[PDB]
UniProtKB/Swiss-Prot annotation, chains A, B, C:
Domain notes from UniProt: The interdigitation of the polypeptide chains at the C-termini is important to protrimer formation in the folding pathway and to thermostability of the mature protein.
Role this protein plays: Structural component of the short non-contractile tail. The tail comprises six spikes that mediate primary attachment to the host cell lipopolysaccharides (LPS) and display endorhamnosidase enzymatic activity, hydrolyzing the alpha-1,3-O-glycosidic linkage between rhamnose and galactose of the O-antigen polysaccharide. Digestion of the LPS brings the capsid near the cell outer membrane.
Compartments where found: Virion
Lineage of the organism: Viruses, Duplodnaviria, Heunggongvirae, Uroviricota, Caudoviricetes
Effect of D283N: Complete loss of hydrolysis of O-antigen oligosaccharides
Domain of life: Viruses
Protein name as it appears in the record: Tail spike protein
Record GO biological process: adhesion receptor-mediated virion attachment to host cell; symbiont entry into host; symbiont entry into host cell via disruption of host cell envelope; symbiont entry into host cell via disruption of host cell envelope lipopolysaccharide; virion attachment to host cell
Family indicated by similarity: Belongs to the P22likevirus tail fiber protein family.
Subunit annotation: Homotrimer. Interacts with the host O-antigen lipopolysaccharides; this interaction induces cleavage of host O-antigen. Interacts with tail hub protein gp10; this interaction anchors 6 fibers onto the tail hub hexamer.
Covered residues, full protein: 114 to 667 of 667
Length: 543, 543, 543
């Protein structure tokens, strides 16, 4: 029977039969079932002997610190893992029962409680976020470092599916072609919830966060260090949700970490949602002179050819910035940012194109100077501004087209704004006695319109009559001077004349006349510039 | 050997070894394989003893009524389940071989056949949808109630994957943190295909429909009762497809059910597609005085703070409304609705923002009064109307910006329409001898333009000449009065004058003159309002 | 014990216990584990006896040619399969280290190397793509046909999950309700990476490519032949990524293959990304007289009622066309195409609607005549053109609305362009001394504006003064003739007059006067058309 049984049954060992995880790992052939809670000590390392295993978790891994998995064969899968710390730390919860953010350090300190979730352990970044909190926090709430972390080290082709936990963290160190799939809402600890760190060895490649949701945590939900997906953009974050990150939803590290670069290139950031991060929705910058990376002489600060594939992202409720990045030669599309306390978008980009961007009700707490900032020479095609709620857009070197929304024109600063390809136009006016097409030369005034074409009702609704007027600003008084057609249904043109003797230089073109007033004779004269360019003054109207 | 075998093999029991499902459930330790069809009786209840099981289905559960699973441990997974009724009911199929909807009750009654799919059992809502069908339906086709339902009751953390069936239904009753994942196109029965009902106990939370597709069914594909995802929006529908729902694709219940509220809050509805529902694509309203919910004194009807996260939805072919909802303080974005028989969008919302909405060819059967209706004071930023096919938009209290499409201006009714931030403009005219920029004051007339700025060709194409004309409406005749520049390439301005003696009140501003006709002397006069405001009549031109 | 063991353990056989795959297949009951590499010969066929199996792959299937799986029961699942050829062919790599495409045949021939990835085997389509390469390629690099293909034949309800490989191919022949799910980046061979071919038997239905990523391959990544998803659109490509396809990312075949039609209907193509295809991003055309399909007399060429559901697609870096299709009565939405060498969109469609299309920096290598081409009578609602880089759009029979971007108006050709529903307008000018609203009648000139309304600064910034001018083109000189209001802050209107004796036909309307110059008396005259229509010439101004 043994011979037969050996050939007809699925192989799997279960933790309940062993004293240690390493013993179970050593006995494993195909499957490994975690069927009893396991308390691990920080730094406990398991060697899987290069075996391609299917680890099914139906119990918890309990401990503060890292449980290190090494030598898992390519194709190994871990499903249902649940990390939980032994320590219950002091956490702050910077939001109210009405989901309003608390910005006052004293109000935030008052939220302190011991819990493994529904808040996060304060870190030094909170000292910046809630000014003065550093001196108000009790010593037992400062410098905590609790995280129950599953560390997969130097493995290739290992996937973690439906992971969860309390004060949990997942770290892929020196890995490639690894994925964090369908995370079942782990509640984060002190460190990043899902981190792909490749500071040693080759640049990380093929590392992804696919689907799932992540909550809380003291720092960023998902983070990458020294990863390069190559031209194929093999790596990144797709289809994920981040809720209430202590720092940002997604963060590609910037600057030097250790003696090398922590920057990232060629990754995808698509079809994702980030809600209520304490800092930013997406922090995709690379610069904060670049050991291990491109020299500043080759690519200036904030001008690295990051080449990320960025599309279809939604950010809502950030206490910081909705979407931030730097880099040169980027193409970004379909970004929607709503209800953010700081800038909806903070772009330190150059020679980049932004298509179909919607920044709705951001910088609601005046944390920044504008709702959207772009430093370099970029192109914006389709920009929706203003929802239902300091410049709105400050992109001094950018050319923009297609802004929609109830924007205050005086709060727009761009290099060039144009609608070169509209067809025949109709201006439809609702709730007013007139329709208008205004012109504003920002060089002259950002607050006053320099001229206009209006249509005003004569009499009342249903009169079937209106008058058209062409205006010009004078003495900083909009519409000071105007020509009217059909005022009071008179069917004639009312023409403005120079109130005094017209100077020779008032007339511009040949074969034109400019009427002027000669008060001493109660006459209307006309300065005429003959077709030959010569000036002559004629009498136009008299008593 | 037994000792060894017990430690090296994967545990799983299979239904073929037991007489009843409960017996198999009682023997189960890790896996449970459904390897033989099982006929269950309505109300048959299985107690899983709190075990965390992996139930793999490779056969059907056959029966009319509910098969109730209870006490499944957190982390349990059911995959491949297939529900099928024992009864083959009478179903109607309200569409033709060309996929045209049938709206005539007699034509619909004629489609009657006995089948477990490709149609649905008529319900009372059909009496409303196809007027008169109630009296035409034969008695054996009325009041049917066939559904083979898998009911998961009061469980936490249970997921159902790749479910399918015929006349199938899936009901999570009193559950939390449960998911219906990658449904493999079950064909629905009388009840909802996937329902999360939490009328008793705590409000449902963490309940999701993730991916998959659902077809037919007499009522809504996915439905939620008394679920609240909290600030974290933990719950909802993401990435799913609904085809031909007897009622709606997605429905959040409204009103009182029993002695409590069936309403829902804080859920996500994203990246989903609903095609051909008999009623609506998405029915996300909460109100139809609110036992178990907010009092009408706190939040008026249709003004509950639902706070759903709604983004990236596509609806096509609804016989009813594409997208419907109510509520206050909502942010909705990226909705595309095409080819609907009733309104594309029916919004009973207040103080809400709608960004990038596309309503293309809706209300094609004039079921409603408009293509898009918004009752309250909302903001619309980016609205695309008209495809290739009664007001188009009726949002009396809303402010709109960014409408694109061949809309008939007379079919627009909003509180305010404006393009405050366009740049320098160019109106490009194709196929006509002129380009135009028209002005229409809706208060004066919704059908006639009150004035215009035109450019007309002089001679023919390639003449290199055109004349510009500024017009005004008079006597309800558009462009009745006008000033022209360069008519017939004359290089002069043609000026209109009052056809008779100008009355003193015809002139508006100081330092302006208004020419008028004095027929009895064949003279042109000029009513002049001197710079000092005084009126004087001068002779302008004579024989 | 045997009795007990037989009832409590999971059944699974493993390849390591058998000499051939068929032997393992015959012994299988529930699971089948591929735990050792298996070298198969081309055409090796395995009969699974109608069993519903779960095949778990933890090793490779090695061989050139097809490994044919037949008679798998409905519900069977294959996970982790890895196909690899025995031959290492000669492949070309038409791109540089900077990711620039190589278009020169000699430069491409120089990339030749023997490898199972990072390039592809040249085919006859390359002879067209890189002109002259046919004669430059060494004979050992021509006509190669290496592909290690898993062929699933005539099965229903079989899913392949997380497949991978080198020179790999996956072919579903005569299958229905089959899915290729979460492909783990297989590197393609000579044939399509995932193909659903239904040339024999019923039209394919329920066949999908869900998620995953595919790379390289000589032809298209995903391809369909004779599939019809029905009204329910049961089939297609959703959520996938294609990188560097030798031909196109997605291809629905066109024309006759064998003695039947290879065309496809009613499929979904959504939420997908295609990057760097050598040919096109999406090739969704059906026509290239139609055996096995609609006769040309019923539906003319390129006018088949394909009815695909197309939404949310992104294409970047195509050496060919970004998005291409034909058909009549289509609704297409939310397409974003960036940085393509050939046309961003090539549409041989009629009576179709395109909503929210963004074509950014395409036809960068002038491969085609335009960035977007539409042949038939279509409607475009929302079109974003120009990023940071020959007509731009040539849609002679289409009506368009909502173009945004820095488009050159002279490069637009459409049947009608209009913005019928804008509200009150403001033209904001940045960086210039004037704001402008120009009018261009394309029938008159596609390069010159026929008239304009300008506002120009008087003096300098902060002067609080500007003049408004209405212009008209004459003698092909834009703004040749104009009326000004407030030039040099004079507060009067400068009026142009006919430089010579005005001919009777110069005046257009009654009750209007046209000033003209009478040089011989240094007088300004006025041709007057009295309110009764009669002409009279009066003296207007004199010395």
């Amino acid at each position: 029977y043994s011979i037969e049984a050996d050939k007809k049954f699925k192989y799997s060992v279960k933790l309940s039969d062993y004293p240690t995880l390493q013993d179970a790992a050593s006995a494993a052939v195909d499957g490994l079932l975690i069927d009893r809670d396991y308390n691990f000590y920080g730094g406990e390392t398991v060697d899987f002997g290069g075996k391609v295993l299917t680890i099914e978790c139906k119990a918890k891994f309990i401990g503060d610190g890292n449980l290190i998995f090494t030598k898992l064969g390519k194709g190994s899968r871990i499903a249902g893992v649940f990390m939980e710390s032994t320590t219950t730390p002091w956490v702050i919860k910077p939001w109210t029962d009405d989901n309003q953010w608390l910005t006052d350090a004293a109000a935030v300190v008052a939220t302190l409680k011991q819990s493994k979730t529904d808040g996060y352990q304060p870190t030094v970044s909170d000292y910046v976020k809630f000014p003065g909190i550093e001196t108000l926090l009790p010593p037992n709430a400062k410098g905590q470092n609790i995280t129950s972390t599953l560390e997969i080290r130097e493995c290739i082709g290992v996937e973690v599916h439906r992971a969860s936990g309390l004060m949990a963290g997942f770290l892929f160190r020196g890995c490639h072609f690894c994925k964090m799939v369908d995370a079942n809402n782990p509640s984060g600890g002190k460190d990043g919830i899902i981190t792909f760190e490749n500071l040693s060895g080759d640049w990380g490649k093929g590392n992804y966060v696919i689907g799932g949701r992540f909550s809380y945590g003291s720092v960023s939900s998902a983070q990458f260090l020294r990863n390069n997906g190559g031209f194929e953009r093999d790596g990144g974050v797709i289809g994920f949700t981040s809720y209430r990150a202590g720092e940002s939803g997604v963060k590609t590290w910037q600057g030097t970490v250790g003696s090398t670069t922590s920057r990232n290139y060629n990754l995808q950031f698509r079809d994702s949602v980030v809600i209520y991060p304490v800092w930013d929705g997406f922090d995709l910058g690379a610069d904060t002179d670049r050991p291990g990376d491109y020299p500043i002489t080759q690519y200036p600060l904030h001008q690295l050819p990051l080449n990320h594939l960025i599309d279809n992202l939604l950010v809502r409720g950030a206490l910081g910035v909705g979407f931030g990045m730097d880099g040169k030669g980027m193409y970004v599309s379909n970004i929607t940012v709503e209800d953010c306390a700081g800038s909806g978008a903070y772009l330190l980009t150059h020679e980049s194109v932004f298509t179909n961007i919607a920044i709705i009700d951001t910088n609601t707490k005046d944390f920044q100077a504008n709702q959207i900032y772009i430093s370099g020479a970029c192109r914006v095609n389709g920009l929706r501004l203003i929802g239902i709620r300091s410049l709105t857009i400050d992109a001094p070197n950018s050319t923009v087209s297609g802004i929609t929304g109830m924007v205050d024109p005086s709060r727009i600063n761009v290099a060039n704004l144009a609608e070169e390809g509209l067809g025949n136009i109709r201006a439809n006016s609702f709730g007013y006695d007139s329709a208008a097409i205004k012109l504003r030369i920002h060089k002259l005034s950002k607050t006053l319109d320099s001229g206009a074409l209006y249509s005003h009702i004569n009499g009342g609704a249903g009169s079937g009559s209106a008058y058209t007027q062409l205006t010009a600003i004078s003495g900083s008084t909009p519409d000071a001077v105007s020509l009217k057609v059909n005022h009071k249904d008179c069917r004639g043109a009312e023409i403005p004349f120079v109130p005094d003797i017209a100077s020779d230089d008032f007339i511009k073109d040949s074969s034109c006349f400019l009427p002027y007033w000669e008060n001493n004779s109660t006459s209307l004269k006309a300065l005429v510039k003959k077709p030959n360019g010569e000036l002559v003054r004629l009498t136009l109207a008299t008593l």
